[PDB]
Symmetry: D2
Subunit: 392 residues, 4 copies
């Protein structure tokens, strides 16, 4: 079985099948024609091998999908126009009115919004549970529970879930487990190997790695993916990935291993640096020994990731001053880009919220999140250094 | 107000604001950075211009939207990853359980599937009505009726609706009118100017014109489009259009007047040809005086369009054989490309159904649909001629 | 029957591609790949010799570029095509392969500025003898031919006065003496004029202009005999220029070619209306447009060009102060130097391009102080008329 | 001065200057317009301006150029359509009939072809010298010697030149030193900091790193680069770089350091393995102690590189048999891609030539060249090991 890097570069493509082309040709075409109409008849049912549109079986998209399936250890993959494309397409197909879905304590903000103000407003029961608490999860299960969905690590405190534990319970009650694995990528964590049924990504982040495309991936069993493809994507979302964007994603995946290696190595030095500084109240980085769940993190993740969360003494005040003083880090909401990014949700995303109710969302007053990029650590250290001084 | 072609080329763009570039730069970027956090704070209550993330808005996508809204004559536009992206995003935000949606008698297959096997299984009521029959439409109106959605012309037989008459009946009961204007484009038909609240396109078709991208457009009021943007696209479908694909769509829109002129002139000659051939049982082209709704077609569409539906005397077998004989037309289920296309639903998209099942949904055994392309009319006539001899 | 040639539009959209041979893909896949591989090493031995038809490296050939080339060949009526990084890529690659020190090249009286520069300050400085001739004067061309005359190169219509050459007449003189004729066909495209069908050996294009049609790519084409195009591919392009066309940009070029016939029809119809309007205006001293009888080479234009083109040149009364104020009054026309874009462009040589020079130096080289040049775009003619009408008013 | 990786990601770009866009917009435009004729006046021999036409100046090309300048430590950069475009544009600008150019003993095939079958047939004189031999170089200088051109390391046997020594000699005769730095990249070797005047790159190789674009770079002093831009590029080649390709090139450059580190580590291992094998007569790799110019290589290269050449004992047959046995390595003539590549000149690039002409040229019958990619090293070893066995 060839290694991860090899697969990320080569899996599902032999140059001999496309006129010797070393890089697969991009199928920037909206539709495909048939040799006969009897060949056309077959395509819509399924029993002849081939393809019928860009919204289903484009070969550029098929290669992306297969390759992501191999990296995550799944049978099947699906490419979509965004991470929200992947999440919505998945949940829209697996759920109907009367079904219940269990969720991690905290979710990505647009995932939250979709559940509460979207699919939850169409008669689907929403329930929140701490997914490191196996006992509380078992007490939450009802006979209507069709889907369990969470992130691990989850934003913003890097809260881990016991994926193998959750999956064991879910397998008892006939529930489907869906893990958003955006933060780790398959290089660092493979939740399908710990017993999850489906994984979903915002490929916009680390997989692409260059902040230039928006894209989502679903990986899991052939049977779950076929359904999500033919119902969620085809009928209910229309979140079709451009073959141009899919080829840029495959391009980015070719350096995934190296990029994540650098993200992690930079993030550790920065996290260890933050630990020794007097402006920092507390840190959430999985590779510090003081991280509450350092044990579980190491069982699931092979390295501690590129994301650092920390809190500043001075709260909201010290955050604004820290963020505005950064000259190399950019002030922005994304993650997993080559460029280093900083976010202080109290004064950026959630300055439309009040301090009195802010703590209901698990958001500390002075919490600043850092996506550590690929820049020289010395320059990133110096930029962080002077911004901590400007926050006092 | 400058002419259509001037606006299709120029609207919403001055080179002088982008270093004099004649063609606008392509904003191929997932995220946008802020100068400070209090500047960033503004943008998450809609207080400042510029932007934050490409899943919500992007300057290339804004220009496409502005331009498309100018051409339909509407206030605001939204760009999405596909036509189904446009339709689902729209309806997901406008309907909730208990609401009724009133549908035209026939619909594009995937739209039918969204309604019957998607949103209609989440407790939204569906009723089908002949939109040409304004008495029966009035009769169908309940106060639960929140949306009237149709295509004009509609698949499969080019059936039409008096748009202004439907808008009148909507105004009376307080329902929102959504018209799928894919076939006509804003060049031949402007439903917003006849009372519709919203229009949706598969920009994949004529607007692109070249078969290379998948894309969707919503046009209407700022109020409705802002909702569809912030709920349907942002939370519920995730169908984000790639900036690369938006820039191609804009390139296609610059020749839309020229292409539609040639599309229409070619189909007219081809329609008049088919009406005289012994193998043809009947024919539906809006440009023929024998079209059932000829008067309504000259009233609403400025030209008769590029699509032809006709039925062969020999039923399903003659259809197959006609389809297989085509050498210049391709066998495919799209339309509005430079290449002429053909499909025969009874042997392609609807084959495993029986004759009874297809007559129920309006599809004759010998119904053939031609998308007349931009090729030399003599070559297309010659290809059609021989395929008809082959059909017997 | 089936030995009839498909019409121009049919071939612009279909020629040399079948979706069935690439998985049903309606649009051909883009081979954005720098390199190709070999199944055995013996398959690779033949592909650097000439025995086995295949693919080696994209600076020589690539299937996206090949399709583009076979298609342009068909439209021009040539055996073969080559695609390059720019118009000047096509020209330099062609002239660098055909000429050596001691050979003479006969040139039209006017040329595109970068071509002029290439010949006088480039290849002419490497031992290649240059000679200018009026190519509309067949007696003067006959007279300037020598035994060293290897290539006759010209544009028709020529930048910027739109001086025409008798292509058939030039090719006959070239048959007799033995020279290779190279025509820059940028202005007309294969839709309006096909120099190879009139006897030229090679044609070159700046496909950046009308062939693209949308101002977004830089590209060149050469069309001619298999032997010469091959020679140009393997000597000029491969060793001497490296002006490789990106497969992305070639795909866009093929996209633009699919509407070439429709865009040119509208360019021509807009410029005809605009030319007739400008002729009847008080401020206009004279106007140059091939579709007007007052065009110095009216009958030559009608003989070689199936329509009169999208380019107009005219002169304003009032000199430079009039031209300056005309240009700054334009609100739809953009001030810029190019042609064959969807957007209408205007340049005023005096206050723009030839600004460093004085009014005396511009009397030399035939550039009037009110000489405006127009690339008529695809916008609604009433808007273009209006923009020119209000601009003339402000130039008074 | 920030570190290499920081500059590779950020140099010459502030998101704040383009509406916050994290990735810079792609200026895919052939022409630029002017606000007035007076602004237009100062771009045709223009002092205080931006740009006029993409064959001379485009913001996207300008950014790539300034970034590549920073990495090589030179004043100005120029982007072109291919490496051969960069070489030819340079040499067409600097040489005229009667000038001599002094060449390294071996050259990349097309460069040699340019020199002997292009510019050398236009009156320019050619002389080949060993550029490690400072006394032979001094003996070869003449008053006609205007350019000294070479690669370091050089195809086929990784032969090095003493760049600082060469530059000292060129200085005494006023000659311009041009170095092809394609193999090392500015990450491993910066010939301008060793006294060279100009560097050229086939960015098609390592700079891109993913095998999808053809691109050339020239970097050097302002006055030289200006002339190559306005003469070589503008007039004599027309080798204009597509902005789309420049944007991809810039994408690839953001991981150059990480990619190069891995290319080198993979190649170091494979060289160690190949030196000890029975089938291997000789090996040329800068990282081995047995490499003739080991000390000179370590003075100029911070790491030994990703390229290996070695000779098989069994001659032409062993080469042929080895190449055909490869399953993971592709048979192909490029280099610096993520995918590992192999070429055996004597049965591929130089098959037509006689054994006597190959020896004269520098090519051994069993000379195999490896471009070691980014795959998992254990897979690359397996593939090489079995191919070595099949070589019998």
């Amino acid at each position: 079985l060839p290694g991860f890097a090899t697969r990320a570069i080569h899996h599902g493509y032999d140059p001999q099948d496309h006129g010797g082309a070393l890089v697969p040709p991009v199928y920037q075409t909206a539709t495909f024609t048939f040799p006969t109409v009897e060949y056309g008849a077959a395509c819509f049912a399924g029993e002849q091998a081939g393809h019928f549109y860009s919204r289903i079986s484009n070969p550029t998209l098929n290669l992306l999908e297969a390759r992501m399936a191999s990296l995550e250890g799944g049978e099947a993959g699906l490419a979509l126009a965004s991470g929200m494309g992947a999440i919505t397409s998945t949940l829209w197909t697996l759920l109907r009115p009367g079904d219940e879905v269990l969720l991690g304590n905290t979710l990505y903000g647009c995932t939250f919004a979709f559940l509460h103000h979207g699919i939850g407003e169409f008669g689907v029961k929403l329930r929140h549970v701490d997914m490191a608490d196996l006992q509380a999860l078992e007490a939450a299960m009802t006979p209507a529970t069709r889907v369990i969905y969470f992130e691990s690590p989850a934003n913003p405190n890097m809260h881990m879930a016991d994926i193998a534990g959750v999956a064991k319970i879910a397998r008892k009650h006939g529930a489907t487990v869906v893990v958003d694995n955006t933060y780790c990528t398959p290089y660092l964590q493979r939740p399908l190997e710990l017993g999850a049924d489906l994984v979903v990504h915002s490929a916009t982040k680390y997989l692409s790695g260059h902040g230039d495309i928006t894209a989502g991936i679903v990986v899991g069993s052939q049977a779950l993916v076929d359904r999500i493809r033919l119902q969620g994507l085809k009928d209910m979302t229309g979140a079709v990935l451009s073959p141009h964007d899919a080829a840029l994603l495959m391009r980015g995946i070719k350096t995934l291993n190296l990029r994540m290696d650098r993200h992690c190595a930079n993030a550790q030095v920065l996290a260890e640096f933050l630990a020794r500084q007097p402006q920092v109240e507390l840190i959430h980085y999985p590779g510090l020994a003081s991280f509450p769940q350092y044990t579980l993190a190491r069982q699931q993740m092979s390295q501690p990731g590129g994301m650092i969360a920390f809190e500043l003494k001075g709260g909201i005040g010290a955050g604004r001053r820290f963020m505005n003083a950064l000259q190399l880090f950019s002030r922005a909401v994304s993650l997993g880009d080559a460029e280093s990014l900083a976010s202080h949700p109290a004064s950026m995303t959630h300055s439309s919220y009040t301090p009195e109710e802010r703590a209901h969302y698990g958001i500390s007053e002075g919490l600043v999140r850092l996506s550590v990029g690929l820049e020289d650590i010395d320059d990133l250290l110096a930029d962080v250094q002077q911004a901590l001084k400007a926050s006092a």
